Every structure is written in C-alpha cells, then in structure tokens.
Ligand binder design. Structure first.
Ligand SMILES: C=C(O[C@H]1[C@H](O)[C@@H](CO)O[C@H](OP(=O)(O)OP(=O)(O)OC[C@H]2O[C@@H](n3ccc(=O)[nH]c3=O)[C@H](O)[C@@H]2O)[C@@H]1NC(C)=O)C(=O)O
Ligand SMILES: C=C(O[C@H]1[C@H](O)[C@@H](CO)O[C@H](OP(=O)(O)OP(=O)(O)OC[C@H]2O[C@@H](n3ccc(=O)[nH]c3=O)[C@H](O)[C@@H]2O)[C@@H]1NC(C)=O)C(=O)O
Ligand SMILES: C=C(O[C@H]1[C@H](O)[C@@H](CO)O[C@H](OP(=O)(O)OP(=O)(O)OC[C@H]2O[C@@H](n3ccc(=O)[nH]c3=O)[C@H](O)[C@@H]2O)[C@@H]1NC(C)=O)C(=O)O
Ligand SMILES: C=C(O[C@H]1[C@H](O)[C@@H](CO)O[C@H](OP(=O)(O)OP(=O)(O)OC[C@H]2O[C@@H](n3ccc(=O)[nH]c3=O)[C@H](O)[C@@H]2O)[C@@H]1NC(C)=O)C(=O)O
Ligand SMILES: [Mg+2]
Ligand SMILES: [Mg+2]
Ligand SMILES: [Mg+2]
Ligand SMILES: [Mg+2]
Ligand SMILES: [Mg+2]
Ligand SMILES: [Mg+2]
Lengths: 425, 425, 425, 425
C-alpha cells in the first residue's frame, strides 16, 4: 500500500542472486489504454505493471466519464462508449504529461478534443509541437486557449495525410498512429519512432481491426477504417525494468535470471553489459546475467532513439560505472541535461564530472551511504542501484517518483537478496 | 502571512505605472549572515529583504544553537557566542544549498564543521568541489561521510594560501574569503567572482575589522586577522529585483521609477533594456524606465558571470521577448538547462524554440492566460511578467519558490497598477 | 580540364529555368568501387559521376597495383587480380578519408590490410573507432603503428560476428558489410545506417553473389560466402546533387526539372522545399520544382541520419534561408560544428547567428557579391547558391573542394540559365 | 630562412634540459603596430618576436602606403604620415584576420576606413559583430559591401560612447580602445578583455599621449585626445610561448629555465603544471620548471578569458595529458570546436575522446611517431610536443602555420636538447 511520503532504506554490500519476473511495459500500457478510446466494444488490457502511471491514466478516464474496471486478475477493461466529457483536465495532465496520448484517439473517434498542453517536466525540453502539426496534417483545426489544446476534426472526420517527423518522437508517433487508425484514407508517417512500444501499439490496433503496417521501421502506413472493436491484449515486457535489474545485478557483482522478458528489445543494453564484463545468456523469454566474481568494467554510453541505448537506462549505467573499474563517458543526445541523479550520487561519494551532455564517471570500489532524493520516475532507479553498492545505509526520499516508474521495486530486489525496506509515509 | 500553498492570480493588459522601493540583496544577505559566525562580538545586518531564504538561514543558525535577534525594523543581530553544535544538518541544507556558506566561517572561527553536501537542484549542474579544494588549500582536512562535508582545520587554525578558481564561483569566492579572514597569513584568490555581492561581503568583513582587498577584481588578497568585531551593516540593493521590475514595466509597455537601488550594479541589463527601446534615466540611487507607448523590440541575451548579463535575469528577458517585436536569441553559458519557464510560457501561447543552451523567441502581441507552475526562486518571476502581458487570467501555483527570491512581489506590483492578487493557501 | 587553382565567378539575380540530368551517387560509387576488391572476376561500375573523389579512388587502386579501366562510355572496370600491395598509403588517404572503405574488403579478401588512419577533417570530429571495433568483432586483430591501421584476420579468415553501432555510421556500416560478405558464417549489424547508398552497396554485393539482407533497415544480416564474382552495376542517382539543384532553383524563385533521379531518396528535403513555398511534382525518375517567382519562406531544419534531413544538404538550406522571408533555425545533430559556410555568407551580407550546433538565419531580399572561399566538398555548394542570389559578382576560390563533390557544377547551372563561369587556374 | 613548404622532423624520447630566452608577445605586437596609425610622429616598437604574423602586418601597412623600417636592433619604426590608401585589402586580410585591428585606429585618425570582413577560420566561430557595434556606439556608420566593412565617422570625427561587450573580446576591446583614444569625449568599455596584451596596448597608447585608464579590469575609461605622438615601446613577454616551452619540458619529464618572461601573466598555466607534478620556481623575469624525470600526472583544464586558462594553451595540455598518468578532461569555453590537433595526435596513438567542447584524454606511456598536419598557428605546437614524446620520428607538414605563431621553434627546442630538424621546402 504505497503512500506519497514513503521512503526506501537500503543497506549495501550484497551480491544479488535470484530470479524475478519482468512486468508489462509501462510505456506500452499508457498508449494502449489511450487507444481504448477508439473501440466501440470493450478492450481488456493485460499484463499491466502495478505502478502509479497506470492509476493516473485510469483516473483520467474517470474524469472523462469512462469507468475502467480492474478485475481479479488485475487486468483493466475499458468501455469508452459511456464517455461524457471530451476533456483531459489540466489538474490531471499537469501530473503526467503522457496524458497527451488521449488527444489523437479522442479527436479521431469523437471529432473533437480539449487536452491540457503539458508544461515543464524537470527531465528537459519536451515540447509537443509535432503532435499538433501531425494532427493538423490530418485536417484538424487546433488552437491553444486557456492552456488547452482545442482540436476539432473537419466535417466527415480526420483525413489521411503524409507527415514527416523533424525529430523522432515516441508518443508523437503513437498519437498520430491512433488518429490515423480512424481517419478517412491513407496516412504515411515518416521518420517514425521505432521503439518496441510503438510496435506493440500497432499490434494492439490491428487486433482491434485496424490496418497499421511498418511499425518498427522508419515508415508507418495506416489505412484508416470506419470503426474499431474491442480486443484482449497482453502488453509486451518492460525493457527498461529488464535493463534496470540486469544493471543492479552487474553493479553488485552478482547475478540474476529474468523471466517473462525479451532480449530482442534491449540489444544495446545487453551488449554494453557484455562490454562491462557480464556473462549473459538468453532464451526466447528469459535473460540470465552472471558477473562470476568480477567487478564491472567501465563502459562508454551514448543515448539515442531505439534501437540505440535508451535515455531511460542512462542513469542506471552511471550508477554501475560509479563502482566500476576505470573511467566511463556517459553521453546524452535525447535529454541533454538529464543528470540530476549524478548530484545525488555525489553525496554518496561518486566521482563524476558533468560538462553539458557528458558525464565522466571514475569508478571507485564502493560508494558511501547517505540520504538522497528521487526526482525522475525512471532515472531515479539509479539511486536504488547506488544504494546497493554503498557502504552502510542509503535513505531515499520522494519514492513516489520511483513508484510511477517501477512495480514494487523493493519487493523484487528482496527476492534477489538485497537488503532494502519500504519505510511507510 | 505567506503559506506554502499560496497562488497568484494575475489579469493581464495594464501598462505599469508607479514607484516602488528596492529591497536589500538576498544574495548579499545570505553570505553576510554566514559571515557573522566569524565575529566575537554581535553583528547587526540591516536593509534585509523580507523573503524566505533569510528565514531559512535564521532557522539554520537556530539548529546550531545561535538565536538571532530580530528587531522592530526587521534588522537581524547575530551573537555566535552561544553556538552549541557545529553541524549544518541535511534536513535544512537540502532545502537551500546556499546553506553551504556557513562552511568557511565555521571552519575558520571554530576549527571544525560538518555541513551536508548539497545534492541536486533542478536549475542545473551545481557541484561544490571548488569550495572543498579551496579550503584544503588553507590546510583543512576534509572527508565526505554520511552525506556530510566533515572538515577540520590544522592545529593553530587555517593557514593563508593561494587558490585558483578553474571556474568562476560566486559562493565559492565568498566561502574562501570568509575562511581567509581569520586564517593565519595571506590568502590570494585568483579568477575570483566579481559579483557586487562579493564586494558587499568584503566591505562588511572590512567593517568588522578584516583586511580584504581587491574584491570586484579577478584577484582578492586577504590578510588574516585575530578577531572580527561588531559592525552594523546595511546590505546593498538587490540588482535582480531591480532588473525584474524594470523588465515588468518594459514588457507591459509602461513605466516605473525604482528607489533605493544602484544603476552601476546592472549595466548589462540597462543596456539591453535600451536596446529593447526603453527610455532610461538614472541617479545615484534611482532608476526610471519609460516605454513611452512602444512595444519592446526583441533583444539577444548571453548569460555569463558579472559584469555580464546575469543568469538570474535570463527568464525575465524571455518573457519580455515573448511579447516583443521580432526574434531574440537567449543563450545560457552559466546554467545551460535553465529553461523550465519556457515550457510554462508555451502553455500561455509563447513562441519559443529551445535547442540546448539556446532559446529562440519569436514575439507575439499578447500571450494567453493559463494556469502555470513556478519552480525556480529567481527565474519563475518570468511567469509573473508573462501573466502581466497575457490576455485574461494567469494562475501561478508553487509561489513558495517566488517567495524565496522576492519580497512580497504582488504587493510591489500592486503599487505599479498591476491586477494581481495572492490566493491564500 | 579542372585545375587546383580554378575559381568560379557568379553573377546573381537570374531566376533559374531549365532541365538537367542527375548523375550517379558519389557516395555509392566510392563504397562500390571498394567492393570490387572482393571479386575474383572483374566488376564494371556504371553511371559514375565525373568528379574528383572517383579519380582519387582510382589512383588509390593504382597504388595497390590495381589499374581500373575507363571505357568509352565512362564506366569503370576493376580487375583486382593484379593487386600487389595491401597498403592504402597515407599520401593518398590524407586527401580523402573515405579511402578507409578499402579496409573491410581488403581484410576480408586477403586476410590483412594496412590503411592509413585518417587525421583531421575541417568538418569536425570524425573518428573511426566503430570501423575498428566492428572489424575486431569479426576477428580482426588491429594495431595502430606509423600512422597506419594494421589489421590481420584470424586463422582461416574473418569470422561472422555481431556488432552494435553506438552511433549510426554510413561508411562504418558499409565497411563491415563488405568484410562480412566473405567472412565465415553469419554477421548481424545492429543500429545500421539506412542511407540509400548502403542499400545500393548491398544490392551490388548480392549481384556479385553475396547474401546481404535487411539493408535499409536498422538490422543487416550477412551470410558470408567463400568467393564473389563479377557484375555490371549501375549506381543509384545522387540525392545530394538532386537536393542541391532543387534548392538553387528555389532560392532564385525559378523552376527546374531534374531527370534520372528518384524522389523517394530525399523525401525530407522535398517536404522542406514545400514548406519554403515550392510547388513540387514528381514522376518515377524525375522531380520538377516551380517557385513561380516567389521569394522562399524561411524554414527550420534539423539534420540526422537518413531518412532524416541530411547534413550534406544543411549548408544549402542556410543559403536559401539567407534570402527567405522570415527567420529559420538550422540545427546540426550529425556534424555539430559544420558551419564554415556561414562565415563566407556573412561576407556577402547574410544575417546569421551561430551558437553551438544552431544557426539562426534572418532572411534578407538579396545578398551582396563578394569573394569567398570554399572548404567543404558538399557544403560549399551553398556558396554557389549564395552567389546566384547576390547583387553583382561572387568569386569563389578553392573550387577544387566543390569539384570533389559535384560533377561540373557550372556546366549544369549554365543549362539552367545561371550566369556562372570557371576561371582556369 | 623559412619557406611555405617546410616540414619539421622530430625524434622523440629525450628529456629536455636547458634554457632559452622568451620573445615579445605576438598578440601585443599586432595591436601595437595597428596603434601606430594613430600617431603623427614615428613610433618604434621593440622586443618583437621574429615570426610571420609581424611580416604580414608590415606588408599590410605597405599596401596602405606606409613603409615600416626595421632597424639594426630588429625594432620596427612606423611613420604613418605617408599613408595613401585607407583600405585593408581582402587579399591580405584573408590570410590573417587579426588585420581587422587597423579598423579602429584608421577610422579614428582619418574619419573613414574600408577593411575586408574576415570570412572563415578553421578554429571555429569568430564573428566580429562586437567590433562593428562597438564602433557604431562611437558614431560610426558602417556598411558591408563587396566583402568590405566600410566605415565612416560622423561630422567632426568619432564621439565618446558607452559600449558593453556581450561576450569578452580581446581584439574587440583593443579596436575600441584605439578608436576611443582619438574620439571626442569620454568612452566607457564594459566587460572589457583583461588579457595582458590589452594592458600592454593601453600603456603604449598612454606613452603616445593618450588617456586610457582601467585596462586589466572589466571597465576601461578613455578620455579622447586630439592627437597622438611618437613613442619607443618594448612589448611584454609572450605568455603563450612561455607556456608552450614549459609544457614541452614537463611532457618529456625534463627541465627548463625561461628568461625574459614574467610568471604573473600565466598563473593559471603555472598552477596546472604544478598539478601535473612539475616543480616550479620563479623570479621577477624568469621561470624554472623541473619534472625530475617523472611522468606527468593528468590534469583537467577549462579554457576561458584571462586570467583563466587560455585557449591558446589548450592543445599543448592535451599533448601533455596524452602521455600523462591518468585521465584528464580538457574543456573549451572560448573556441568550443578547437580540437583538430586531437585527430592528428590520434594518428600517433593518443587515446582521446571528443564530445562537443570536451576532450577526454587517457594518458599512455609514449606516443608512436607518424606524419601529421599543422593547421593552427598556436594550437599546432601541440603536435611538436607530441612528437617529442613519441617513439621514433614525427614528420609535421604545413609548418607555415607554426611559423606564424612561434619564433624559430625548432631552434629554441634544439637549445633544450630536442632532436628536431627543419626540412626545407
Ligand atoms: C520519461 C518517460 O519516458 C519517455 C522516454 O524517456 C522518451 C524517450 O525514450 O520517450 C517517451 O517520451 P516522449 O514520447 O515524450 O519523448 P519523445 O517525444 O520521443 O522526445 C524525444 C525528443 O523529441 C523532442 N520532441 C518531441 C515531440 C515534439 O512534438 N517535439 C519535439 O521536439 C523532445 O524534446 C525530445 O528531445 C517516454 N514516455 C512515454 C509515455 O513513452 C516516462 O516513462 O514518463
Ligand atoms: C540561484 C540563486 O542564485 C545563484 C546564481 O544563480 C549563481 C549565478 O549568478 O550564483 C550563486 O550561486 P552559486 O554561487 O551556487 O553559483 P556559482 O558557484 O557561481 O556557479 C557558477 C558555475 O560554476 C560551477 N561550479 C561552482 C562551484 C564549484 O565548486 N564547482 C563548479 O563547477 C557551477 O556548476 C556553475 O556552472 C547564486 N546564489 C547565491 C547564494 O549567491 C539563488 O538565489 O538561490
Ligand atoms: C562529407 C562526405 O559525406 C559523408 C556524409 O556527410 C556522412 C553523413 O551523412 O556520411 C558519410 O561519411 P561517414 O560515413 O564518414 O560519416 P558517419 O560515420 O556516418 O558519421 C556519423 C557520425 O558518427 C560519428 N562516428 C562515425 C564513425 C565512427 O567510427 N565513430 C564515430 O563517432 C562521426 O563522428 C559523426 O558524428 C559520407 N561520406 C561517404 C563516403 O559516404 C563526403 O562526401 O566526403
Ligand atoms: C588565434 C590567435 O589568438 C587569438 C586568441 O586565441 C583569442 C582568445 O584568447 O584572442 C584573440 O583573438 P580574438 O580577439 O579574435 O578572439 P576574441 O574576440 O576574444 O573571441 C572570443 C570569443 O568571442 C566571440 N566573439 C568575438 C568577437 C565578436 O565580435 N563576436 C563574438 O562573438 C568569438 O566567437 C569567441 O568565441 C587572439 N588574437 C589576437 C590578435 O590577439 C592568433 O594568435 O592568431
Ligand atoms: Mg511531473
Ligand atoms: Mg558542452
Ligand atoms: Mg530546492
Ligand atoms: Mg546544442
Ligand atoms: Mg581533406
Ligand atoms: Mg587563415
């Protein structure tokens, strides 16, 4: 029973050892839940991770007059044809900018949508101009007023169009894919995001009766249909959660077997772990990592859109490099100043120099436990890893960020022999 | 009585007109309050601004067993003789990293100090390695443990030394100046910060009986003295507050007379305002700005250490450029990621492209009111200015940031004819 | 007959109008010429552009004891069976770093290679660490000595391997593809370059008997074969030459029909030209652009690997933006300091601000003729375009750069009505 | 006798040991030679270094109709009374952009000037907007036409003005200082460059009858005078030549005593050398460095305007770090892409990673001799130093760059026991 004021207390010094199951991808669940707005019979979304971003998306639907049902198996059924209010309120959107994913499907299905324009997120520069322009390319009339994106479809509905992304955008690609699914005619999205969650969304849409081809490549072709039905869909495994537990095991010089995952959606990460000296073996749906008694070797990292190394794994590799042998350069090209975790790890004795988009990490044998503060729902997992490799106790506050991004992180780490406990708020 | 949950509601569209008084500099008050820890007889600090960072510094002193006396005029007398605990606790330091300013004076006066190592601040990369290295150059033995800087002076006290600043540091320069003031022998600080608050601290130290020469230049020479006495010091005017009200008047196409200020501590800002079309007249302690019925012209800005254009004025010039005639490039060289205000102004219909350290602003005639969120105790004043030039109402939340950095901002703006109200939390 | 000291003299002010034929891709010709070193029977390469990089590659082969034959139709036949010396000399490599393309095929075919390590190129940072690590992944043992990359295959020849490109690399992908073609076993290249020249190379290798699949996607799978035979291969059209003449037309407000090209290999460029106001029609192998005498509209541009907007078209869009209506931001993510053309255009009265990887262009109605200096075999084409839109005469020297990258540029522009002349050195 | 096609051949492996005399500063000589245009009686400039930039400035004066006389003591006397043509031609300016230094004095003394606008320099972005805007602040009306800055003073000549430098500019400060010296009234330059050469220029102007105060500080005040007379002026020692030979000695683990220099104009460099393990002693006009045969320790460096670490010493510290013990980060904030020397050193087996403005150097015990190419009149001295610490021979081409920036470099190194020879072109 997580609470906003929860903390984690970690005692470092244990080599991890054990097996856990990987949960469904948070960032596939979010767009697929938004996609349920397109369906005229109920959609059941399965393999959901139990983390707070799902709760927020469910709350958002509630504010629109749609009451999702969580069954005994913890799957979510959404029947969007009870929708009352075509508005995604600022009160909710300000807490989770991924809420913007309802813009595309709401507009395509219902002919109009008012969605709060996301403001600042501490991660970095994250405008949504390409979401707006892409929809305008489908005939949408859009204005910004009162802090809302106010969108209206042409008479007869959205029309298929060509749209070229000047910058690769994950949720931008997802938003336009969903809108295109019910548009009149052919849509071609160029320089599309290739992220596995984009493919998962396309596969869900096709299960609902859409015609989405090319997901996973630079070019997505959508032939719009008049209506979509509801299906039952299991979201793919979470590659960021997968990578995070592999790094935790590597950093502690231990080992882990991950089940219900997929090695083919984090090749960049697996290769970097092999560079760090990890012994890795894989199967269709499992990964085993074993350091076999060695400290990790420092590695260089460069973030970029999939299939390159993910910005959502960058912080975790800093915490591993922090206790590795040698010097590693960690470079961001996606979110150039996403390094808040560095300055917390500095409190724990890490040796890290930051210049612009580059973090230069000099590994030390062990960090030093200290209280630190989470701020980033994916990157702050690095603070948990840092705690695992620190002398003494590390007390992490503002865990609510981490609880947005990971299912019960301390319960899974306890199964791997970590000394970690949640301190109730 | 300010409350953590206060909001500001603004209605835009009024040309400002009136006169107000500028308060003492927040960032002179903070190091001068730290400097009072050096004295063996009480020091009284005057012309203090009534804002929350001073309250936090007073609370920090209390935690160490020093209870400042606040008189009827809100002057603060500090008697450090009662000090009980040579520790600046994480619980407080984590709320205000400027707390690190007590490290130098406590070490030099009392021979030891434990001060929590600041973690992350959302503004950007802000390590304090130069504070530590500088103190080590004076013979201090320093380790980081449990998240604390644990410092001990040699037997006989700190010794004079040479320290070269690889990067210009405002509080770094201040910390070492204070440590040097009671050290044994001569300290030379090279590539020193030239900020007017550094000069003000030196002038206060000298009033207290120190021997600090060269403040304001690249090189500060300190001859340590035996004891520092009991001065009554009026801190200099706040140049950021000054610039902020000047920009507010300019952005609204109105005018303002500022009293109890000093034009010579913001020449960069005055020149940029003239470039924007402002008519400016000055006297020894006042500034008058009048737009004479013109819209501001877009200007380019480049932040750098004093006397260059201040990073603490950068956001405010974005909000002016956002309603100016033409396109203006706003470039950070101090905090390359300090642009969170941009994304709030985008909710208000601003036209701003951000690429790394560069914000390209295309002016529009008027912004559009929307709810927005403060995050930065100096830069979020730009959201107040944006509200003043927006159509309709702008509701700003998390005002507690702004109340750290500005004395009663809505009360001063009311005197200039702004339609602005504090909504009590 | 070109000479190292040739100049171009341009008189601006004429709307271009006419049609020309597009030549084969220089950057397909170079890797395909390299690939002929793999074959045990002669390979004939057709549709070659007549420009200096081809001449340099042929000279390189000569230095290794391979003498290509240029027939009457200007096709090049290469019979690598006479090869004598497995060395790419520094004397030639220092003039053309793309010479490194012989490293992969020489190593795979002959079991060893010495190729001079390229030093500095004024474009910016261009290390070849991925070429080296990629070949090591196929069993190469590589040393750097005397300024040479000295590479040796393992017993029995190169072996199939897996390699993940941390950064997308065009010639790195090509080098590894060629080496994989004769390796023992399966090679998988991940995060591969998708440039059309990479596809063209794969298609030529397959025509020679190889088994290269997936070129054009991020994952290339190669099944090595023991030997490769001859082929007669026509290289695809040059998308950069195509883009350049389209911009030349657009910038002068003219029109042009380009024959023997392919719109599908420059979709990003075509879309940006439409944004600038151009009317574009296309056929299977032609593109026609008509400005209808209108001044172009300023556009924003962001370079990235194919299919995104190419760095090799960036400078050309600066020269169009230089005379456009409005302000356009031109952003590099590939070669972040490739802006030397800007400072030449400034001599012609362009209004351009550069900060880091961003050029901010404010368009003026016309430039002003002045003597300027080429430095970049592709980007300096922008100086020719600038001259076409300048008042009076523009004299460009160091044309030898441009002659590397474009087939007789003045002769093609003359066909479009340009007033341009080559001044013989 | 120097020739354009000269090369240097270096044999590495010797610890340097000896003493040489330091020459006058090139970058004081250049603006002081320009300043002679202000005087109505001959000025004699003394302690000049014998290097090619001086020769170019003398040739420039020649093209204007002024014939400097080089006397028996190799001092230069300039009598600007004979001047005939107020034009600095592109033919000369294109070879040395520092030629722009004649703009300010020509305009101030003669009421008009035409000076070619410098184009590209491979170092990176070097616009001269602040020179132009600064002179406009003194009443100049300026056009760019035919690639010339064409400048005209108002009726009665230049007028005292205020100018704030948005970015610190060395030659910008010098140009405005010279122009102000003959202007009618008071000029204030704010955020002025503090470089020692700026002080040296001011002292020479004052010797000539000017009234320049505050040079060396952020603020320079000039009271214009109607005429300036002659002077005999000895330029100060060259701090960059000084730094370079100290690094050459340190990199080889040797010793050197430098005479006729001044430790107080390179404190940042001396401190970094001590960090690298050098034992340094100084006197009023000499510096002695002794490594005692020890390998240097890696250091971090960050360039910035004087008195910070100079960009003109950056490359030399990369060459020392290249053979040092450890990892050193070398960061540019002045010329953020000035790293061409890195890629030549990579040919010699250096281990350097460049990302943006940061070079990460991993030291190795020795480099490996290879042919390399100079491109930068100050930074390419790093290639000479790299050759001194490389196994075998290093052949450096395009030595003419180095001959611009250093007086007879191989002759001075020979006095220290280097094995180095000039190969005549
Ligand atoms: C942080 C999260 O994950 C993030 C993850 O970090 C990023 C990068 O991989 O991709 C998703 O964000 P996103 O879709 O908002 O980010 P993208 O749009 O791909 O941003 C990539 C780049 O494109 C730029 N961008 C994006 C959209 C747009 O209209 N304009 C634009 O310029 C952004 O500024 C950024 O530089 C994840 N969120 C979801 C719901 O899929 C999270 O879990 O909340
Ligand atoms: C944000 C505030 O104001 C800030 C103001 O923005 C900055 C810049 O002018 O100077 C003061 O901070 P500061 O002293 O922490 O900042 P500085 O140390 O000058 O930082 C300058 C640059 O040096 C770097 N830096 C600084 C210190 C150090 O040890 N190492 C280092 O690398 C920082 O990362 C930054 O890039 C103000 N704070 C006070 C109490 O004077 C505030 O009011 O809370
Ligand atoms: C300039 C030319 O064209 C260039 C064209 O600009 C670029 C970008 O599209 O792709 C080819 O160069 P390239 O293959 O050397 O460039 P890429 O390797 O793709 O460089 C891409 C990025 O990767 C980086 N990179 C590349 C290789 C490597 O081992 N390491 C690395 O860090 C580079 O620094 C650059 O930032 C063209 N050359 C040929 C023969 O195909 C030319 O015609 O000579
Ligand atoms: C390279 C040389 O030395 C250079 C030395 O590297 C630099 C930096 O210390 O200062 C002089 O150049 P400079 O005066 O052209 O350089 P500065 O003007 O200080 O440039 C500093 C920074 O300001 C920027 N800058 C400068 C002037 C201007 O109008 N606008 C502008 O943006 C430049 O882009 C650069 O980023 C030396 N030249 C002379 C004659 O004094 C040489 O010897 O030829
Ligand atoms: Mg949030
Ligand atoms: Mg940087
Ligand atoms: Mg805070
Ligand atoms: Mg950038
Ligand atoms: Mg070249
Ligand atoms: Mg030059």
């Amino acid at each position: 029973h997580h609470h906003h004021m929860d903390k984690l207390i970690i005692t470092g010094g244990n080599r991890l050892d054990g097996e856990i199951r990987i949960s469904g991808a948070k960032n596939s669940a979010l767009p697929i839940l938004a996609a349920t707005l397109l369906a005229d019979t109920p959609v059941t979304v399965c393999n959901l991770p139990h983390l707070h971003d799902i709760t927020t998306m469910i709350e958002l639907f509630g504010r629109m007059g749609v009451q999702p049902i969580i069954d005994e198996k913890l799957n979510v059924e959404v029947d969007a044809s009870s929708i009352k209010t075509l508005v995604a309120p600022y009160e909710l959107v300000k807490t989770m900018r991924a809420s913007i994913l309802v813009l595309g499907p709401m507009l395509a299905r219902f002919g109009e949508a008012e969605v709060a324009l996301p403001g600042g997120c501490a991660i970095g520069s994250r405008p949504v101009d390409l979401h707006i322009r892409g929809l305008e390319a489908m005939g949408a009339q859009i204005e910004v007023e009162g802090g809302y994106i106010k969108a209206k479809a042409p008479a007869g509905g959205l029309r298929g169009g060509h749209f070229f992304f000047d910058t690769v955008s994950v949720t931008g690609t997802e938003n336009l894919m969903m809108a295109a699914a019910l548009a009149n005619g052919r849509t071609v999205l160029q320089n599309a995001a290739r992220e596995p969650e984009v493919v998962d969304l396309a596969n869900c849409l096709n299960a609902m009766g859409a015609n989405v081809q090319g997901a996973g490549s630079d070019t997505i072709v959508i032939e719009g249909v008049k209506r979509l039905g509801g299906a039952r869909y299991d979201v793919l495994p979470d590659r960021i959660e997968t990578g995070t537990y592999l790094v935790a095991a590597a950093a502690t010089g231990g080992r882990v077997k991950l089940k219900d995952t997929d090695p083919t959606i984090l090749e960049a990460v697996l290769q970097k772990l092999e560079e760090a000296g990890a012994h890795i073996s894989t199967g269709s749906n499992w990964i085993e990592l074993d350091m076999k008694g060695n400290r990790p070797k420092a590695v260089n990292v460069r973030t970029a859109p999939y299939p390159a190394f993910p910005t959502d794994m960058q912080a975790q590799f800093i915490s591993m490099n922090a206790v590795a042998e040698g010097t590693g350069a960690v470079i961001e090209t996606v979110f150039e100043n996403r390094f808040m975790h560095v300055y917390e790890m500095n409190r724990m004795g890490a040796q890290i120099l930051v210049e612009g988009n580059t973090a230069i990490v000099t590994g030390v044998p062990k960090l030093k436990g200290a209280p630190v503060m989470a701020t980033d729902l994916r990157a702050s997992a690095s603070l948990v890893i840092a705690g695992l490799v620190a002398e003494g106790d590390t007390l992490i506050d503002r865990i609510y960020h981490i609880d947005r991004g990971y299912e019960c992180i301390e319960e899974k780490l306890q199964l791997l022999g970590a000394k970690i406990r949640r301190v109730p708020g």
